[PDB]
């Protein structure tokens with residue numbers, strides 16, 4: 001951070017999304033005419049929720065980390081009643097939004113996204129940084145439709161022990177993280193497995209009706225496949241969704257897997 005801004009250095013545009021922490025707007029840096037996103041968070045919420053650190057972690061990590069499949073953080077600043085985050089703007093929304101718009105993905109999008117995601121993680125891991133929050137809602141699409149990871153607030157360094165009171169949903173977390181135990185760079189691989197299954201099926205493999213119900217499904221790795229899911233896909237998903245973190249593939253193994261290579265553009 002060599003420069004410091006102010007809400008006045010921008011021209012806020014249309015609202016992009018989010019709700020309770022604050023909203024995200026399309027922004028235009030007056031000086032340069034640079035387009036970007038401006039996620040505005042209210043101090044009121046921050047404090048009362050005690051996220052001071054996740055925010056610090058987000059602005060922390062995402063500031064340094066620089067990769068084409070990771071969403072950039074350009075800086076931040078806060079006015080009297082809130083904090084602003086200067087973010088890379090991703091022209092094609094979230095992957096979460098695309099999935100609603102398409103229901104399920106073909107083996108090509110699925111394969112591709114997984115690839116871009118692996119490279120980004122492969123890089124994140126380079127720096128012993130585990131995301132631990134890879135869900136389709138934290139995946140944006142670039143001007144060329146490329147995946148771009150965001151939200152490293154829940155992201156920390158590994159190995160780790162943190163038990164952090166709740167995540168809203170357990171869908172993307174692996175047994176270790178739910179079971180409250182120690183975890184590492186492999187948490188991101190179980191998630192990669194979940195995303196893959198979801199992308200092709202339209203629902204995460206452990207979806208349940210109750211938090212409790214899902215924790216059961218997860219903790220026992222109980223998942224089945226629709227008939228349309230091909231064996232190549234099944235193989236890789238079954239390899240990523242291993243109870244034992246140490247039995248999950250390394251990102252290169254994933255990046256070389258036949259089905260991935262046979263369909264990733």
Ligand SMILES: NC(=O)c1ccc(Nc2nccc(Nc3ccccc3C(N)=O)n2)cc1
Nearest residue numbers: 016017018024037087088089090091093094
């Ligand atoms: N409504 C759309 O077509 C649309 C949605 C999203 C983007 N891209 C984008 N880039 C950077 C940040 C960002 N923030 C968020 C927007 C919505 C929800 C959550 C966030 C967020 N806290 O990351 N969104 C572009 C268009």
